[PDB]
Structure formats: structure tokens, C-alpha cells
């Protein structure tokens, strides 16, 4: 009855599996290649399952499983894995055989599989390369099928690795040895060798196709986006302000934990996450106010504000924050700039927290105080209930407690 076949590489990077693969593919279209590296890290159905897949209709003989499998423990995961899921996808009647096809000679030098591999693959990126191959070396563990799990292949292929630019190319010899092989052990698979032509044409488009490297090599870079945009607010102008709750008995809970610097919050990434209204408003800060310099914590950008503070609230043992109004952001030549808008409804700066709170509940603070869409107006001195929290609010007596020029900045914490 039916005989299916999984043929298993041992290998590192760039060893010339694809290569071999590739070629071997396009003499027979009816084997399957399942290429590792075209598999998401996040895919549900992986190698495993879609070599299954790939062998459940009759037609389907051949899985050209292409991965590196390095180390002994991958080679002992193929056939665990398969063992388990085989009933969902294959008559109890059918083999499956495992064809290992070794592609490190056992007598090969670590410094010679590497300068022929490495130089391989060189021939726009430099030395992302070099730790990601050193990898598949540093846990590469040479077939051993006296022992458990290489003794479970059903057949062993052992190819030749070399420099080869004075001779024919290992994988061309590889492909032939392959395919010598099977003619002979297996003719179920191969009734009759192609010719010599067809396997050397087959083996050029192969050479020539665009390479595939693992996911790790070709891992783009994080274009990383700044953790929030503020306003330095010049230190001693917040702190000689806030005389007016210095005495409150509600207050005295928070002087030792007044912050060391203030600021506004324009923008924190995270609000790109709430609403379509926080994204957008976060990208148009991004773009406007540029991503500053990243290896440094804040960055002073060439933008400032004027700022002038409306209210203290204290959040009973929790916090203290001024409510504020920006009253207009412009750069260097004082050219206004109307399209940054603030993602925060209820502009603040925290002045400090009883180290359970932080410094984000300054906004559910004021968001909670002006909770009604349409009375927005500074509420007048006194308590408040709000949830759980006790407020207290203080106005100031100057209405013109304006602050000019305050920098913007952008944060990466
Ligand atoms: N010199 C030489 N280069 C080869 C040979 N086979 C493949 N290559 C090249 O080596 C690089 C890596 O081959 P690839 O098949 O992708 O290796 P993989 O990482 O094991 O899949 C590619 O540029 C191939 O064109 C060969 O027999 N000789
Ligand atoms: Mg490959």
C-alpha cells in the first residue's frame, strides 16, 4: 500500500538546503517544499502540521521538510510531534519514512564549515548575520543514529560540503547523490534517473532564484517611537505657586514626595491604544515633534509653549496636580503651531503622589472632577466626592499666572 516520505535535513545556515531543495522540486513538482523560514514565529499550523497537510491526498508522496534542525532535540520534536497529530491526517495503514539528509560531513572542521558557509551567505546587513549563524553552530549536534532520535530515521543520505569554485558545485553533486539514491532504494519514488540536462538546468534555476534567509537575519529593525511629549515647566515658577495649599492640612501628606521636576504631558504612547482619537493624535505629535535623539531619556525639542495655571486638586492621600491651559505652542521664529493638539482632555502637571498612586492618576483625577461633557467650567473651591476619592480644589487668586517659553520635549523611558 501507499509509502509517504519526509525528507529531514541536518544542517546550519547556509549549508545549501534551499538550494538542494529548489532544485530537487523543480525536476519533481509533485513533491511539496515546506520552507521554515516562510513561516511566521506566530503561526497557528506550523512545519509540522502543514507537512501533514501536505501529505493527506494520495497524490502527495514527498514532504521536502526545509529547516535546520541543528540540534538533537529538533530532530526528536519531528517525531514526536508527528506521532501525535499522524491520526488526523493519515490511514493507519500508511509509512511515513523519514530520510535524513545530512548536510555537515562528519569529519568536517567547525572552522571550515563556517568559512564556507558564512562567505555563502555574504556574496545590506553585515553582522546581524554572524550571531545568528554562530548559533546554529554553537548547538549543532552531528546525526547519531546509534541512539535515540537519529536511530529512528528509516535512511541516511550524506552529502558533501565544500569550497567549490574550481570545481563542480557541492550542490549539484548533493542534488545527484540524492537523487542516485533514491533510484536505488526507493524506485517507488524515482521510476526512471532524469537526465543529466534536466537535473544540471534544474540545479542553474535553482543557484539563481532570490535566497531565503531564517527570520532572525532578516529581522528589521524597531523604529522606536518615544514614550511621551511634555512641556518643561520651569521648576521654581510651580513650586513658588504652590504656597496656596502649603498649609492645608490635606496637603501636608504629599511635601515629601513633591516631585524633583514638572512638566505638562502633551502625549503618552499609550493613549494611542484608548481610542482611533488617541492615535491619530499621538502620530500627528510624532510627526510634528520629531522622534529627538533616542540613547538619551528627554530631549529638548525646538518648540515651546505658554502655559498658564488654573487650579490645584489634591486627590486625598493619593495626589496633587495644577489643572492648566496651554495658551499657544510655537517654534524657534515664534511662528505659531496650530496642529499639535494634546491628547489629554484635562492638561496637567502632577506636583507629586503617595508612592501607592502615580503620576497617571492625575488624569482620571481632573477626567472623574469634570466628568460631565457640558460643565467644564473650573469648579469653585471646596470638596468633592468623585468615586471613591475625596478632591479638594483650590483656585488661584492671580488669573494671570502665565508661564512663557516653556520648552517641549520628547521622552524615551
Ligand atoms: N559556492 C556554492 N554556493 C552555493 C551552493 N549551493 C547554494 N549556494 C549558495 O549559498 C547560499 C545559501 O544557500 P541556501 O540553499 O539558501 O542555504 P540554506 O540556508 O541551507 O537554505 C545561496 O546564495 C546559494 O546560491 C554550492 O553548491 N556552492
Ligand atoms: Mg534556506
Redo the contacts with the bound molecule.
Sequence with gaps: TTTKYIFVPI?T????????F?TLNNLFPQWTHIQNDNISKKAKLKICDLTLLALEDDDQSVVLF?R?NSASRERRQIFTTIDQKRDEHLDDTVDLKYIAIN?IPEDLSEEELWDITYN??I?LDENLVESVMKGFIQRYQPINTSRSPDDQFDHVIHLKLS???NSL????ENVRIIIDDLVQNFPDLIKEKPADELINECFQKA?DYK??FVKNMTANTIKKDPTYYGIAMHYSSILENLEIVSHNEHFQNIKSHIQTEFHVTLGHIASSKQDKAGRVKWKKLVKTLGKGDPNKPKSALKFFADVKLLQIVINTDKLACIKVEILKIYDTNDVLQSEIEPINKQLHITIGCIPPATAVESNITLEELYDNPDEQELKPDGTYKCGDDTLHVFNFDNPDLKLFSQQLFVAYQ
Excluded at 13 to 20: A, E, L, N, P, Y
Excluded at 169 to 172: A, E, I, R
Design positions: 544542517a545556515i547556509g549549508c545549501g538546503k534551499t538550494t538542494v529548489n526545509d535546520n548536510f555563502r551567505v556574496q569550497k567549490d569554485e558545485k557541492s550542490s549539484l543557484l535566497p531565503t
